[PDB]
Design a protein around this ligand. Structure first.
Ligand SMILES: *[C@@H]1O[C@H](CO)[C@@H](O[C@@H]2O[C@H](CO)[C@@H](O[C@@H]3O[C@H](CO[C@H]4O[C@H](CO)[C@@H](O)[C@H](O[C@H]5O[C@H](CO)[C@@H](O)[C@H](O)[C@@H]5O[C@H]5O[C@H](CO)[C@@H](O)[C@H](O)[C@@H]5O)[C@@H]4O)[C@@H](O)[C@H](O[C@H]4O[C@H](CO)[C@@H](O)[C@H](O)[C@@H]4O[C@H]4O[C@H](CO)[C@@H](O)[C@H](O)[C@@H]4O)[C@@H]3O)[C@H](O)[C@H]2NC(C)=O)[C@H](O)[C@H]1NC(C)=O
Ligand SMILES: CN(C)c1cc(C(=O)N2C[C@@H]3CN(C(=O)c4ccc5[nH]nnc5c4)C[C@H]3C2)cc(OCC2CCOCC2)n1
Ligand SMILES: [Ca+2]
Ligand SMILES: [Ca+2]
Ligand SMILES: [Cl-]
Ligand code: NA
Ligand code: NA
Ligand SMILES: [Zn+2]
Length: 805
């Protein structure tokens, strides 16, 4: 109940919300059915429209008008945005040449440059080029300020998950808004776009920018606008707020546009009907900038133009139906569309089986347009698992397609020609970022970056301390003229041991054998230098990784590779080696096929054993440094040390062997040498964070050898490929992957074929950032380079996408 019989006189677009049943006059009251009786009359004036004409200049102030052209309007803060242009011979902002804004030029009383966040729904990255002729204001912001060629949304590339990621710097799994539609089993409650449940504060985790500002005594404009409030009225309201006295004035403001998303759904991303919505958005930008210029704020305010996600061509006829695969379709609930999430229809049904549903959905039709996953098996780059609201069974849908339960769902809900939600690496889903103002750089391009990074920068722009989030603070410093945040490298927590020869061969009873009893002092000092680290500067190019948690580990040197060997996990945390362009690939000699050798620097008690692999009928083993890339027949024996061995399912050894035998050399030849760091990952609770010992759900049978959930590699070389990886004088180039360690290759529908037809495609799907691996391992890479730390932070957030132009 709201007693809607109070008044909005003098309260129009008030900043503090009032508590029911008192009637509201804020920009959200409509959405709550709670506005005072006179809200439209007083607060939503429309008389005479939004522009001054010649004949209104100097007019007598008529309060009924939407905006004013009277003499007193500038000091009242309520002129039409084109007032000075029409009535005072001023130019439109877009017609002025751009001049660098070296320092903020603010009216007295301003303590900091305000921030205006202009968000556009469904604004695909390529609109910046393809619509440039009809968006002159946006094009001026873009070319005069700082821009990226695109910004990466989070998965799923839906509206609410991305708007709230923008607000919090959090992944949807952490902020809780994991779709436009959700079921929370603990609350037993459902969230949807339409309706009241979504207003309950319990859905919304983390700490969004407006709360962060408020707690730190920076005042915030109310960020959300009722859908019926016209864009012109939003702009005028913001401009009026910017004329409040110093003590009442917000420092941060938000504008949100439903376009071009609304039209893109109807007409597709490049439908000819799309030109008009783009023109209209640009006109709104022009109104804001002309209004700021009137207030002399156009060289004071930092403006961010940002999208939530792109738009892809999708039609009703491109729908896969679960009823074409599953026998018991009525025993499931699907969240449908551009992603799929499946749960049991009834919790009282003990006949329900996820394993059979997955099997019924796996590679069933020659060009099936979705792939099922248990959520813990999704690519780790999506960070889409650690939330009770994310159903165990997930469908990744091909771009341009929909999934539905039954055909009746499509025609008893073609309307739409566009949709979004797909994998966030998909080109059509990428969106836009422009920063313009005193604090942003002038005429500067920056590389694509992820939207999780923006919260930190919005905090920097306002002098705020960000709440803990998933951005990497400092990685977007290169966007900014000043207000940079100067991060320090984390402190190493565990120091390594450097073991020498300490054990005799006969102390080991590991059940391993090697044909290596084949015997010279010229070369005997040599093997010794190599074991003491003589070639370490060749193979460890960026310093050893730092271990950021408490543990016991050994640095082990070899001719061809260096490793950090964990006495707790019984295997390396990391193995580092450099492969030059000239390197040659050799095979494993026949006699050495099953060779595993005791490492006399490491005690039997802290070693794996071959017996466990023999007894374990499911598990085999592989090596982190590959024997194929040994520098000499003698160096090869090092690759067979028990300390270089890791557990691997036979199915996974197909992937791993092909990566090591074929792909490393291919990368080295293409990138002019590569430095490789590989290792195991344990993430049994799928939280994207390093497991402790007590979280490991699986061991090699009859032993304490933990089974990794994933294996990673980080492949670095010189950005200037005319320089070899091991002699690079400047910026680096990286690509990385986190491959799931699976007992089958069900994920790859072509896996019965030669590895050359499917393995590289798998690896590409599982591309990762160095930062993702840091989280999953507790390691810190690139500790000793010649590069600035902010630049290294940028490198660590880079994702190699494998999408064309
Ligand atoms: C991306 O960035 C984010 C943000 O930094 C990272 O997430 C953080 O990671 C931390 C480690 O996982 C986690 O810390 C835990 O916090 C517990 C208290 O949490 C509450 O308070 C905070 C602070 O305001 C709040 O943010 C939390 O919000 C969550 O929960 C509410 C609802 O409950 C949601 O609305 C909200 O969306 C958010 O949910 C998300 O996080 C939770 C986990 O907290 C998930 O379960 C959800 O799915 C969702 O992802 C909370 O309201 C604290 O109690 C924990 O402490 C335990 O463990 C420590 C080890 O240090 C131990 O000392 C303690 O004893 C304790 O154990 C006891 O409790 C156990 C659980 O019941 C029990 O099993 C034991 O036996 C013990 O009794 C812990 O410190 C932090 O909360 C989140 N923050 C956020 C915002 O998610 C994230 O990791 C980053 N991702 C990547 C890939 O890097
Ligand atoms: C509730 N959330 C968080 C939040 C909310 C807003 C906000 O007012 N609305 C009103 C809009 C109504 N609405 C759709 O009707 C809609 C639109 C497109 C769709 N495609 N498919 N279904 C769709 C449904 C979407 C809603 C977002 C705006 C904001 O901005 C957050 C800012 C944070 C800082 O960076 C820029 C954005 N956050
Ligand atoms: Ca949207
Ligand atoms: Ca974990
Ligand atoms: Cl959804
Ligand atoms: Na075995
Ligand atoms: Na297969
Ligand atoms: Zn949409």
């Amino acid at each position: 109940w709201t007693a809607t019989s109070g008044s909005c006189k003098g309260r129009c677009f008030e900043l503090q919300e009032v508590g029911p049943p008192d009637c509201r006059c804020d920009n959200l009251c409509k959405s709550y059915s709670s506005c005072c009786h006179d809200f439209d009359e007083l607060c939503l004036k429309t008389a005479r429209g939004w522009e001054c004409t010649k004949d209104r200049c100097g007019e007598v102030r008529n309060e009924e008008n939407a905006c004013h052209c009277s003499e007193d309007c500038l000091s009242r803060g309520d002129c039409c945005t084109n007032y000075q242009v029409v009535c005072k011979g001023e130019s439109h902002w877009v017609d002025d040449d751009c001049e660098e804004i070296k320092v903020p030029e603010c009216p007295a009383g301003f303590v900091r440059p305000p921030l205006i966040i202009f968000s556009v729904d469904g604004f695909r990255a390529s609109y910046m080029k393809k619509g440039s002729k009809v968006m002159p204001n946006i094009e001026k912001l873009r070319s005069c300020g700082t821009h990226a060629p695109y910004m990466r949304p989070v998965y799923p590339t839906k509206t609410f998950p991305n708007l709230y990621t923008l607000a919090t710097g959090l992944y949807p799994e952490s902020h809780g808004i994991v779709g436009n539609s959700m079921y929370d089993p603990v609350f037993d409650a459902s969230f949807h776009l339409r309706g009241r449940e979504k207003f309950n504060h319990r859905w919304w985790g983390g700490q969004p920018l407006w709360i962060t500002a408020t707690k730190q005594g920076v005042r915030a404009g109310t960020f959300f606008w009722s859908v019926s409030i016209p864009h012109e009225r939003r702009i005028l309201t913001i401009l009026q707020w910017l004329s409040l006295p110093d003590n009442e004035r917000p420092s941060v403001y938000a504008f949100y546009s439903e376009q071009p998303d609304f039209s893109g759904h109807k007409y597709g991303p490049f439908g000819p009907e799309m030109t008009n919505p783009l023109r209209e958005i640009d006109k709104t930008v022009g109104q804001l900038m002309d209004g700021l210029k009137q207030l002399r704020l156009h060289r004071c305010v930092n403006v961010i133009f940002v999208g939530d996600h792109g738009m892809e061509d999708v039609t009703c006829d491109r729908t896969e139906f679960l009823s074409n695969y599953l026998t018991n379709v009525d025993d499931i609930t699907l969240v449908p569309g551009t992603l799929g999430r499946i749960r049991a229809k009834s919790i009282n049904n003990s006949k329900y089986d996820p394993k059979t549903i997955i099997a019924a959905l796996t590679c069933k039709k020659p060009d099936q347009h979705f792939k099922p996953y248990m959520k813990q098996h999704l690519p780790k780059r999506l960070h889409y698992a650690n939330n009770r609201r994310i159903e165990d069974i997930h469908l990744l849908v091909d771009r341009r397609w929909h999934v539905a339960r039954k055909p009746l769902d499509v025609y008893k809900k073609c309307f739409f020609q566009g949709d979004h939600g797909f994998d966030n690496k998909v080109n059509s889903m990428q969106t836009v970022f422009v920063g313009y103002g005193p604090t942003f750089k002038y005429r500067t391009k920056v590389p694509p970056f992820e939207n999780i990074e923006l919260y930190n920068v919005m905090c920097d722009l306002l002098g705020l301390k960000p709440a803990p989030n998933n951005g990497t603070h400092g990685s977007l410093n290169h966007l900014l003229r000043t207000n940079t945040f100067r991060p320090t490298m984390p402190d190493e927590v565990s120091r390594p041991n450097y073991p020498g020869i300490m054990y005799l061969q006969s102390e080991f009873d590991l059940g391993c054998t090697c044909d290596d009893k084949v015997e010279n002092k010229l070369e005997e000092l040599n093997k010794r230098l190599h074991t003491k680290g003589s070639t370490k500067e060749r193979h460890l190019l960026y310093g050893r990784p730092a271990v950021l948690y408490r543990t016991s580990y050994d640095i082990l040197y070899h001719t061809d590779f260096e490793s950090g060997y964990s006495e707790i996990f019984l295997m390396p945390l990391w193995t580092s080696y450099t492969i030059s362009k000239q390197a040659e690939v050799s095979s494993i000699p026949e006699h050495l096929t099953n060779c595993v050798r005791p490492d006399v620097r490491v005690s039997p008690g802290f070693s794996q054993n071959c017996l466990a692999y023999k007894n374990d009928k499911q598990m085999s083993y592989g090596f982190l440094f590959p024997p194929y890339l040994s520098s000499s027949p003698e160096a090869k024996y090092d690759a067979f040390l028990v300390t270089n061995m890791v557990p691997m399912y036979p199915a996974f050894k197909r992937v791993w062997a092909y990566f090591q035998r074929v792909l490393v050399k291919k990368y080295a030849s293409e990138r002019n040498g590569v430095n490789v760091i590989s290792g195991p990952i344990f993430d049994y609770n799928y939280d994207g964070l390093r497991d402790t010992e007590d979280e490991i759900k699986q061991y090699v049978e009859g032993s304490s050898i933990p089974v990794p959930t994933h294996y990673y590699s980080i492949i670095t070389s010189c950005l200037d490929f005319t320089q070899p990886a091991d002699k690079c004088d400047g910026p680096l180039s990286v690509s990385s992957f986190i491959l799931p360690h699976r007992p089958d290759n069900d994920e790859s529908c072509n896996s019965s074929e030669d590895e050359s037809k499917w393995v590289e495609e798998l690896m590409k799907m599982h591309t990762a950032r160095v930062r993702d691996i840091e989280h999953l391992t507790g390691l810190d890479f690139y500790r000793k380079t010649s590069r600035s730390y902010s630049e290294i932070l940028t490198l660590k957030t880079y994702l190699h996408t494998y999408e064309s132009e």
